[PDB]
Short mmCIF file of all heavy atoms in Angstrom, two decimals:
data_model
loop_
_atom_site.label_atom_id
_atom_site.label_comp_id
_atom_site.label_asym_id
_atom_site.label_seq_id
_atom_site.Cartn_x
_atom_site.Cartn_y
_atom_site.Cartn_z
N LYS A 21 0.84 -1.18 0.00
CA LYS A 21 0.00 0.00 0.00
C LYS A 21 0.88 1.24 0.00
O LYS A 21 1.83 1.34 0.78
CB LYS A 21 -0.94 0.03 1.20
N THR A 22 0.58 2.13 -0.90
CA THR A 22 1.13 3.47 -0.90
C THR A 22 -0.01 4.43 -0.63
O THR A 22 -1.16 4.02 -0.48
CB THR A 22 1.80 3.81 -2.24
OG1 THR A 22 0.78 4.01 -3.22
CG2 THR A 22 2.75 2.71 -2.70
N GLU A 23 0.31 5.72 -0.60
CA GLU A 23 -0.72 6.72 -0.46
C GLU A 23 -1.62 6.80 -1.68
O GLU A 23 -2.64 7.49 -1.61
CB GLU A 23 -0.07 8.08 -0.18
CG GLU A 23 0.56 8.14 1.23
CD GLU A 23 2.08 8.04 1.21
OE1 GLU A 23 2.64 7.46 0.25
OE2 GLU A 23 2.72 8.55 2.17
N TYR A 24 -1.28 6.12 -2.78
CA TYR A 24 -2.12 6.04 -3.97
C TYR A 24 -2.84 4.70 -4.12
O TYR A 24 -3.62 4.53 -5.05
CB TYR A 24 -1.29 6.35 -5.23
CG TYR A 24 -0.96 7.82 -5.30
CD1 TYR A 24 0.11 8.35 -4.57
CD2 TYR A 24 -1.76 8.70 -6.01
CE1 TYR A 24 0.42 9.70 -4.58
CE2 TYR A 24 -1.47 10.08 -6.03
CZ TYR A 24 -0.38 10.56 -5.30
OH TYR A 24 -0.07 11.90 -5.31
N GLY A 25 -2.62 3.74 -3.24
CA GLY A 25 -3.47 2.58 -3.28
C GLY A 25 -2.72 1.33 -2.94
O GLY A 25 -1.63 1.38 -2.36
N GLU A 26 -3.32 0.19 -3.29
CA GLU A 26 -2.81 -1.13 -2.97
C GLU A 26 -2.39 -1.86 -4.24
O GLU A 26 -3.14 -1.90 -5.22
CB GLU A 26 -3.86 -1.93 -2.20
CG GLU A 26 -3.36 -3.25 -1.67
CD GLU A 26 -4.49 -4.12 -1.14
OE1 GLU A 26 -5.61 -4.08 -1.71
OE2 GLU A 26 -4.25 -4.85 -0.17
N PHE A 27 -1.18 -2.42 -4.24
CA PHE A 27 -0.56 -2.93 -5.45
C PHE A 27 0.10 -4.27 -5.18
O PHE A 27 0.49 -4.59 -4.06
CB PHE A 27 0.48 -1.94 -6.00
CG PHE A 27 -0.10 -0.61 -6.35
CD1 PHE A 27 -0.25 0.37 -5.39
CD2 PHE A 27 -0.57 -0.36 -7.64
CE1 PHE A 27 -0.83 1.58 -5.71
CE2 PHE A 27 -1.15 0.85 -7.96
CZ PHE A 27 -1.28 1.81 -7.00
N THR A 28 0.24 -5.05 -6.24
CA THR A 28 1.19 -6.15 -6.22
C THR A 28 2.59 -5.58 -6.47
O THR A 28 2.77 -4.71 -7.32
CB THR A 28 0.80 -7.19 -7.26
OG1 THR A 28 -0.48 -7.73 -6.89
CG2 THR A 28 1.82 -8.30 -7.36
N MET A 29 3.56 -6.02 -5.68
CA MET A 29 4.94 -5.60 -5.84
C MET A 29 5.81 -6.83 -6.01
O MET A 29 5.69 -7.79 -5.25
CB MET A 29 5.42 -4.76 -4.66
CG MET A 29 6.87 -4.34 -4.81
SD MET A 29 7.50 -3.21 -3.56
CE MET A 29 7.93 -4.36 -2.23
N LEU A 30 6.71 -6.80 -6.99
CA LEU A 30 7.61 -7.91 -7.29
C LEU A 30 9.02 -7.54 -6.87
O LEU A 30 9.60 -6.59 -7.41
CB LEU A 30 7.58 -8.25 -8.77
CG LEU A 30 8.36 -9.50 -9.18
CD1 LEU A 30 7.67 -10.77 -8.66
CD2 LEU A 30 8.51 -9.49 -10.68
N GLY A 31 9.58 -8.29 -5.92
CA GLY A 31 10.99 -8.16 -5.63
C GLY A 31 11.80 -8.73 -6.79
O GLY A 31 11.42 -9.73 -7.40
N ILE A 32 12.92 -8.07 -7.09
CA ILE A 32 13.75 -8.40 -8.25
C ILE A 32 15.06 -9.06 -7.83
O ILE A 32 15.37 -10.17 -8.26
CB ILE A 32 14.01 -7.16 -9.13
CG1 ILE A 32 12.69 -6.54 -9.60
CG2 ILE A 32 14.84 -7.53 -10.37
CD1 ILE A 32 11.82 -7.51 -10.42
N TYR A 33 15.86 -8.38 -7.02
CA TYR A 33 17.12 -8.86 -6.46
C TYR A 33 17.51 -7.92 -5.34
O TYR A 33 17.06 -6.77 -5.31
CB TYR A 33 18.25 -8.94 -7.51
CG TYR A 33 18.90 -7.60 -7.81
CD1 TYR A 33 20.20 -7.33 -7.40
CD2 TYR A 33 18.20 -6.61 -8.49
CE1 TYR A 33 20.80 -6.11 -7.67
CE2 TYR A 33 18.80 -5.37 -8.77
CZ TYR A 33 20.09 -5.12 -8.34
OH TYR A 33 20.70 -3.91 -8.60
N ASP A 34 18.37 -8.40 -4.43
CA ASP A 34 18.89 -7.59 -3.31
C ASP A 34 17.69 -6.96 -2.60
O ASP A 34 16.77 -7.69 -2.21
CB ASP A 34 19.93 -6.61 -3.85
CG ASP A 34 20.57 -5.77 -2.76
OD1 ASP A 34 21.18 -6.34 -1.83
OD2 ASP A 34 20.42 -4.52 -2.82
N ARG A 35 17.65 -5.63 -2.42
CA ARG A 35 16.52 -4.93 -1.82
C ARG A 35 15.70 -4.16 -2.85
O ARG A 35 14.91 -3.29 -2.48
CB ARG A 35 16.99 -3.97 -0.72
CG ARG A 35 17.34 -4.66 0.58
CD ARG A 35 18.73 -5.24 0.53
NE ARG A 35 19.03 -6.01 1.72
CZ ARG A 35 20.26 -6.35 2.11
NH1 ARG A 35 21.31 -5.98 1.39
NH2 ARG A 35 20.42 -7.06 3.21
N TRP A 36 15.89 -4.47 -4.13
CA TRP A 36 15.24 -3.76 -5.23
C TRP A 36 13.96 -4.47 -5.63
O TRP A 36 13.96 -5.69 -5.87
CB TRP A 36 16.17 -3.66 -6.43
CG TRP A 36 17.18 -2.58 -6.33
CD1 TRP A 36 18.51 -2.71 -6.05
CD2 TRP A 36 16.95 -1.18 -6.51
NE1 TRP A 36 19.12 -1.48 -6.05
CE2 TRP A 36 18.18 -0.52 -6.34
CE3 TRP A 36 15.82 -0.41 -6.81
CZ2 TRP A 36 18.32 0.87 -6.44
CZ3 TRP A 36 15.96 0.98 -6.93
CH2 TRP A 36 17.20 1.60 -6.74
N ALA A 37 12.87 -3.71 -5.73
CA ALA A 37 11.56 -4.17 -6.17
C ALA A 37 11.06 -3.27 -7.30
O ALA A 37 11.69 -2.27 -7.66
CB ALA A 37 10.55 -4.18 -5.01
N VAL A 38 9.92 -3.63 -7.87
CA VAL A 38 9.29 -2.85 -8.92
C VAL A 38 7.81 -2.69 -8.61
O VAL A 38 7.16 -3.62 -8.10
CB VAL A 38 9.47 -3.51 -10.31
CG1 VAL A 38 9.00 -4.96 -10.27
CG2 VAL A 38 8.70 -2.70 -11.37
N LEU A 39 7.28 -1.52 -8.93
CA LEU A 39 5.87 -1.19 -8.86
C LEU A 39 5.45 -0.52 -10.15
O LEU A 39 6.29 0.05 -10.87
CB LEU A 39 5.60 -0.25 -7.67
CG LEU A 39 5.48 -0.88 -6.28
CD1 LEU A 39 5.44 0.24 -5.24
CD2 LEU A 39 4.21 -1.72 -6.22
N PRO A 40 4.17 -0.57 -10.50
CA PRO A 40 3.66 0.37 -11.51
C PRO A 40 3.99 1.79 -11.08
O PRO A 40 3.94 2.13 -9.90
CB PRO A 40 2.15 0.12 -11.51
CG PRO A 40 1.96 -1.16 -10.80
CD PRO A 40 3.08 -1.32 -9.85
N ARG A 41 4.35 2.63 -12.06
CA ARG A 41 4.72 4.01 -11.74
C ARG A 41 3.63 4.71 -10.92
O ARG A 41 3.93 5.46 -9.99
CB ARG A 41 5.01 4.80 -13.02
CG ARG A 41 5.52 6.22 -12.74
CD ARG A 41 5.32 7.15 -13.93
NE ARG A 41 3.91 7.27 -14.28
CZ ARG A 41 3.35 8.36 -14.80
NH1 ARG A 41 4.08 9.45 -15.03
NH2 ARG A 41 2.06 8.36 -15.09
N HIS A 42 2.36 4.45 -11.23
CA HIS A 42 1.31 5.19 -10.55
C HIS A 42 1.07 4.74 -9.12
O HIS A 42 0.22 5.33 -8.44
CB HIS A 42 0.00 5.12 -11.34
CG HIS A 42 -0.39 3.75 -11.78
ND1 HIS A 42 0.11 3.15 -12.92
CD2 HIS A 42 -1.29 2.87 -11.26
CE1 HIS A 42 -0.44 1.96 -13.07
NE2 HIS A 42 -1.30 1.77 -12.08
N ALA A 43 1.78 3.72 -8.63
CA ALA A 43 1.77 3.48 -7.19
C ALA A 43 2.38 4.65 -6.45
O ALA A 43 2.04 4.89 -5.28
CB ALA A 43 2.50 2.18 -6.86
N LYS A 44 3.30 5.37 -7.10
CA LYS A 44 3.89 6.60 -6.59
C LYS A 44 4.39 6.49 -5.15
O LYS A 44 4.04 7.31 -4.30
CB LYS A 44 2.89 7.74 -6.70
CG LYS A 44 2.65 8.25 -8.12
CD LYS A 44 1.30 8.98 -8.19
CE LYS A 44 1.02 9.50 -9.59
NZ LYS A 44 2.24 10.14 -10.17
N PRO A 45 5.22 5.49 -4.84
CA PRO A 45 5.56 5.23 -3.44
C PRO A 45 6.30 6.41 -2.81
O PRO A 45 7.02 7.15 -3.49
CB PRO A 45 6.45 3.99 -3.51
CG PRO A 45 7.11 4.11 -4.84
CD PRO A 45 6.09 4.73 -5.76
N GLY A 46 6.12 6.57 -1.50
CA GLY A 46 6.82 7.60 -0.76
C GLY A 46 7.96 7.04 0.06
O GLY A 46 8.43 5.91 -0.17
N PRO A 47 8.42 7.81 1.05
CA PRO A 47 9.57 7.39 1.86
C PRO A 47 9.33 6.13 2.66
O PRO A 47 10.30 5.47 3.06
CB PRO A 47 9.81 8.59 2.79
CG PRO A 47 9.08 9.72 2.15
CD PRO A 47 7.89 9.10 1.50
N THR A 48 8.08 5.80 2.96
CA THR A 48 7.73 4.53 3.58
C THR A 48 6.49 3.98 2.90
O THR A 48 5.64 4.73 2.40
CB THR A 48 7.45 4.65 5.09
OG1 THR A 48 6.08 4.96 5.28
CG2 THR A 48 8.33 5.71 5.75
N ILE A 49 6.41 2.65 2.87
CA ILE A 49 5.30 1.91 2.27
C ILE A 49 4.83 0.89 3.30
O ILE A 49 5.52 0.58 4.27
CB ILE A 49 5.70 1.19 0.95
CG1 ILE A 49 6.91 0.27 1.19
CG2 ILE A 49 5.96 2.19 -0.16
CD1 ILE A 49 7.23 -0.71 0.07
N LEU A 50 3.64 0.36 3.06
CA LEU A 50 3.14 -0.80 3.79
C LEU A 50 3.36 -2.00 2.90
O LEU A 50 2.81 -2.06 1.79
CB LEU A 50 1.67 -0.66 4.17
CG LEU A 50 1.37 0.22 5.37
CD1 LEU A 50 -0.15 0.38 5.52
CD2 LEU A 50 1.99 -0.38 6.63
N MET A 51 4.17 -2.94 3.37
CA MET A 51 4.48 -4.16 2.64
C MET A 51 4.07 -5.32 3.53
O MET A 51 4.60 -5.44 4.64
CB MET A 51 5.96 -4.23 2.31
CG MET A 51 6.40 -5.46 1.53
SD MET A 51 8.19 -5.42 1.39
CE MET A 51 8.46 -6.90 0.39
N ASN A 52 3.12 -6.13 3.07
CA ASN A 52 2.53 -7.19 3.89
C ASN A 52 2.15 -6.65 5.27
O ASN A 52 2.47 -7.25 6.30
CB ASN A 52 3.48 -8.38 4.01
CG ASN A 52 3.90 -8.91 2.67
OD1 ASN A 52 3.12 -8.90 1.73
ND2 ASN A 52 5.14 -9.38 2.57
N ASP A 53 1.51 -5.48 5.28
CA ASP A 53 0.93 -4.83 6.45
C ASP A 53 1.98 -4.27 7.40
O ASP A 53 1.71 -4.02 8.57
CB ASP A 53 -0.01 -5.79 7.20
CG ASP A 53 -1.20 -6.24 6.34
OD1 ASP A 53 -1.83 -5.37 5.69
OD2 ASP A 53 -1.52 -7.45 6.31
N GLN A 54 3.18 -4.03 6.91
CA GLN A 54 4.31 -3.62 7.73
C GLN A 54 4.95 -2.40 7.08
O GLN A 54 5.16 -2.38 5.87
CB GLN A 54 5.33 -4.76 7.83
CG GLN A 54 6.39 -4.62 8.88
CD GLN A 54 7.13 -5.95 9.11
OE1 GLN A 54 6.50 -7.03 9.18
NE2 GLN A 54 8.46 -5.88 9.22
N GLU A 55 5.27 -1.39 7.89
CA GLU A 55 5.89 -0.21 7.33
C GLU A 55 7.34 -0.51 6.96
O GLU A 55 8.11 -1.03 7.76
CB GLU A 55 5.82 0.96 8.31
CG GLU A 55 4.60 1.86 8.09
CD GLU A 55 4.46 2.94 9.15
OE1 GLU A 55 5.50 3.38 9.70
OE2 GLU A 55 3.32 3.34 9.46
N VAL A 56 7.71 -0.17 5.73
CA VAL A 56 9.07 -0.39 5.23
C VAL A 56 9.58 0.92 4.67
O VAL A 56 8.89 1.56 3.88
CB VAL A 56 9.11 -1.49 4.15
CG1 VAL A 56 10.50 -1.56 3.52
CG2 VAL A 56 8.71 -2.86 4.75
N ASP A 57 10.80 1.30 5.07
CA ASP A 57 11.44 2.50 4.53
C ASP A 57 11.90 2.26 3.09
O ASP A 57 12.53 1.25 2.78
CB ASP A 57 12.66 2.90 5.37
CG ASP A 57 12.33 3.12 6.83
OD1 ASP A 57 11.33 3.81 7.14
OD2 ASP A 57 13.10 2.62 7.68
N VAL A 58 11.59 3.22 2.22
CA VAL A 58 12.08 3.23 0.84
C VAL A 58 13.30 4.15 0.79
O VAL A 58 13.19 5.35 1.06
CB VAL A 58 10.98 3.71 -0.13
CG1 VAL A 58 11.48 3.68 -1.58
CG2 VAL A 58 9.73 2.86 0.04
N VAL A 59 14.46 3.58 0.48
CA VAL A 59 15.71 4.34 0.55
C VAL A 59 16.18 4.83 -0.82
O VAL A 59 17.12 5.63 -0.89
CB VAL A 59 16.82 3.52 1.25
CG1 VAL A 59 16.37 3.12 2.63
CG2 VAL A 59 17.22 2.29 0.44
N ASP A 60 15.54 4.40 -1.90
CA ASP A 60 15.83 4.92 -3.23
C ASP A 60 14.67 4.55 -4.14
O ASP A 60 13.99 3.54 -3.92
CB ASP A 60 17.16 4.37 -3.77
CG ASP A 60 17.73 5.21 -4.89
OD1 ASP A 60 17.18 6.29 -5.17
OD2 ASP A 60 18.74 4.79 -5.50
N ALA A 61 14.44 5.38 -5.13
CA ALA A 61 13.34 5.13 -6.05
C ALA A 61 13.65 5.81 -7.37
O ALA A 61 14.12 6.95 -7.39
CB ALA A 61 12.00 5.61 -5.47
N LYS A 62 13.40 5.10 -8.46
CA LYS A 62 13.70 5.61 -9.79
C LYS A 62 12.49 5.32 -10.67
O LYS A 62 12.14 4.16 -10.87
CB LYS A 62 14.96 4.95 -10.36
N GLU A 63 11.85 6.37 -11.18
CA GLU A 63 10.82 6.21 -12.19
C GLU A 63 11.48 6.07 -13.55
O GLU A 63 12.24 6.95 -13.97
CB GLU A 63 9.86 7.40 -12.18
CG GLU A 63 9.20 7.69 -10.83
CD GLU A 63 8.16 8.78 -10.93
OE1 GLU A 63 8.38 9.75 -11.70
OE2 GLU A 63 7.11 8.67 -10.25
N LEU A 64 11.20 4.98 -14.25
CA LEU A 64 11.93 4.66 -15.47
C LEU A 64 11.38 5.42 -16.68
O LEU A 64 10.17 5.45 -16.92
CB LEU A 64 11.90 3.16 -15.75
CG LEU A 64 12.49 2.26 -14.67
CD1 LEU A 64 12.41 0.80 -15.11
CD2 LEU A 64 13.94 2.64 -14.35
N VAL A 65 12.30 6.01 -17.44
CA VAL A 65 11.99 6.61 -18.73
C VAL A 65 13.05 6.11 -19.71
O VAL A 65 14.14 5.69 -19.31
CB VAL A 65 11.97 8.16 -18.66
CG1 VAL A 65 10.89 8.65 -17.65
CG2 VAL A 65 13.35 8.69 -18.30
N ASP A 66 12.71 6.12 -21.00
CA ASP A 66 13.68 5.71 -22.01
C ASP A 66 14.63 6.87 -22.29
O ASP A 66 14.56 7.93 -21.66
CB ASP A 66 12.98 5.18 -23.26
CG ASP A 66 12.33 6.27 -24.12
OD1 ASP A 66 12.48 7.47 -23.84
OD2 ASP A 66 11.65 5.90 -25.11
N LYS A 67 15.52 6.68 -23.27
CA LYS A 67 16.59 7.63 -23.54
C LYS A 67 16.09 9.00 -23.99
O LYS A 67 16.83 9.97 -23.89
CB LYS A 67 17.54 7.06 -24.60
#
């Protein structure tokens, strides 16, 4: 859960995960009902 709603999130490797861009996560998220700090975030765009 972010402030924009509830999403499926896929962990990729290490501590890196992916969300749809419109989840718009903030500095903390709810992950399996638990607050987790987000320490970096990159919205992907092409070249």
Side-chain angles (χ1 to χ4, degrees), residues 22-61 63-66:
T22 73
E23 290 104 335
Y24 288 81
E26 187 191 34
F27 300 85
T28 297
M29 179 174 82
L30 187 70
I32 302 301
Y33 80 110
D34 182 60
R35 283 82 185 197
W36 280 104
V38 53
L39 279 171
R41 185 201 60 149
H42 49 277
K44 287 159 180 316
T48 88
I49 55 168
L50 281 174
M51 181 185 182
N52 304 325
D53 298 314
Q54 194 166 317
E55 267 175 29
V56 172
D57 303 313
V58 182
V59 303
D60 200 6
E63 304 186 323
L64 300 181
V65 300
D66 74 6

